[PDB]
Design a protein around this nucleic acid. Structure first.
Ligand code: MG
Ligand code: MG
Ligand code: MG
Ligand code: MG
Ligand code: MG
Ligand code: MG
Lengths: 114, 155
RNA sequence: GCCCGGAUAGCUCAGUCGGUAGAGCAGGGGAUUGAAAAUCCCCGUGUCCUUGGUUCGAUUCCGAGUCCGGGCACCA
RNA sequence: GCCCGGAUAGCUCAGUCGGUAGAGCAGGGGAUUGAAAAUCCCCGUGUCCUUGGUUCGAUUCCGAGUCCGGGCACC
RNA sequence: AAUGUUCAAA
RNA sequence: AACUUGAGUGCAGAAGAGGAAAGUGGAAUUCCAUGUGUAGCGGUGAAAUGCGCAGAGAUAUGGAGGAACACCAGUGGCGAAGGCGACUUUCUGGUCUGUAACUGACGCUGAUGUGCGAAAGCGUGGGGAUCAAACAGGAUUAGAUACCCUGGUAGUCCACGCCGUAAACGAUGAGUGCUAAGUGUUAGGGGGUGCCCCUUAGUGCUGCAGCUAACGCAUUAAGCACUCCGCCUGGGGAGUA
């Protein structure tokens, strides 16, 4: 529980998830818009990101680590307002990563909406 | 007006009270063109403040507007192909003009059976809180300040 | 004829270990907008089941009490 | 020839365990709006199947009664 | 990214 | 009888997702395994059905299994057409350029037959990861069998065998000669100095002459000539009896 952390966030169009962990994948304190009472498509605002990175980041209480090293899953509208506002708990962002799973034409997508 | 910025040009001096912002609420209690019954009632509702409150109504009066002073507006705007609200902070010229209506609209609601005494219980009990009209400005003060939403909207 | 669980906003649940009452559905009034439904504010009354006692004080502990859910039920 | 279910706004159902009648579809009049359909208010009459009795009181319990649905039906 | 039907006779 | 320009055979080189048969790899989806963790994920205009403390989704490792091969990739290439795009090997068709050594008209078009022929469908097999008719559940409207969402069977996948249709589309049959010019691009071949102009073959645009009802086509003709085959003769009734 001692002073480390990698940041795994995703942001689809619904309920941008923030979950910070250690060098392994062990689940310090996950956080969502859904733990906060956002349901009517305020599940994903940049204001929903404004209370996303805060209530996971400030809920360290065992590590309070030195850097965060974000890994950006989920191409969606809550990206950079969850990484600027991650700094508001005082954690010293210094290098960012963007990992969204790009297929190589594996499985055919679901059909087009109308 | 699609053409822009009709000029303002309104003037408001006063006889004794030495205040531009007191001849405004004489211009809203005055209904039906009878200015000849406004300051007869208004100045007989301010000289009865010090007999009801602890102080002269001057140094209570800026406090009385100061606590009733509204902060935030919710002017609805169908953004970009959607439809829900947006908070707008009021430009400082408009906000007193929005502000003064809540004295008179609740002046005609307090059943004290004398209008120059029913109306003056919202300048007393206005520098001191939880008055009659402070309830609405705290009701709409948290309308979208707590309910913060898409705040990148234009209008 | 026997032991428990309790009657907790108009509906449903919560702590309710004597100084120490909460949520959500509903209702009303604004806003929306061609009109309703959604959707967003602002509000209130709870009942702590009848009643007495250990009571500085009982929604809270005993039992004079109504109702219903869990087991009764034996070789008459 | 036999045992039950009952005739509950004009249509369909509800409690109807003697003091103790409800919903929705329909109808009418406003509003809408170029005109109808939608859509929103505000309204009413029910029948508690014929009739007598235990009746402080029966839509409510008996049976003198009409109609139809459930079983009858045997060697 | 909508919830919107119809216009008796040439 | 001969000749060689039409078409063929030799020689050199040049490209190409042309096909059929094995083999290898990476990204991703899903479902199993276990860590950490706890109150929701997912969902739309808004919402619910569905999954969740019995331990979800987010994340760490690992396993299994099937489908398609991001970047290159482009009015790019190849095939008669449908079409074909990870990589290597085995077999194999076709066209282009230059060259002149042969053969000396051996060619063109094709009635009936003979074959190839997307996608769905059918038969006997296997395979089943994502999708996904019928259907089922939740909203939407007056009703919605629909558009929306959560699931889900056939099928979509491979071998063998049928069916033989489509906006199978440049809505433009096939062959051969001839009539202004610019302009990109691909595969070559010669001339002159990584660069500058000669012609052949495809393939895009802009444009006179000409035809055209007009839109527009215009050296890849819908122009000007010939040769052979297929087809139409007002629309409904009808690609039906
Ligand atoms: Mg102007
Ligand atoms: Mg099959
Ligand atoms: Mg579906
Ligand atoms: Mg085609
Ligand atoms: Mg063409
Ligand atoms: Mg004909």
């Amino acid at each position: 529980n001692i002073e480390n952390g990698v940041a795994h966030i995703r942001s689809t169009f619904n309920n941008t998830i923030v979950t910070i962990t250690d060098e392994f994948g062990n689940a310090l304190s996950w956080s969502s818009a859904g733990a906060l009472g956002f349901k009517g498509s305020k599940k994903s605002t940049p204001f929903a990101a404004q209370m996303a990175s805060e209530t996971a980041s400030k809920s360290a209480m065992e590590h309070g680590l030195k850097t965060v090293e974000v890994t950006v899953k989920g191409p969606g509208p809550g990206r950079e307002s969850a990484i600027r506002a991650l700094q508001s708990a005082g954690l010293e962002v210094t290098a960012i990563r963007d990992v969204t799973p790009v297929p190589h034409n594996g499985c055919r997508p679901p059909k087009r909406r109308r | 007006p699609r053409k822009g910025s009709v000029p303002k040009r309104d003037v408001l001096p006063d006889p004794i009270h030495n205040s531009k912002l007191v001849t405004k609420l004489i211009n809203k209690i005055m209904l039906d063109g009878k200015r000849g019954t406004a300051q007869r009632i208004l100045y007989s509702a301010f000289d009865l403040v010090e007999q009801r409150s602890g102080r002269d109504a001057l140094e209570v009066f800026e406090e009385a507007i100061n606590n009733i002073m509204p902060v935030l507006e919710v002017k609805a705007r169908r953004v970009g192909g959607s439809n829900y609200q947006v908070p707008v902070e009021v430009r400082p010229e408009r906000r007193t003009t929005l502000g003064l209506r809540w004295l008179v609209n609740y002046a005609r609601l307090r059943g004290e059976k004398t209008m120059e005494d029913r109306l003056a219980n919202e300048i007393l009990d206005a520098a001191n809180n939880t008055g009659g009209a402070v309830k609405k400005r705290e009701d709409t003060h948290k309308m979208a300040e707590a309910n913060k939403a898409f705040a990148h909207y234009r209008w």
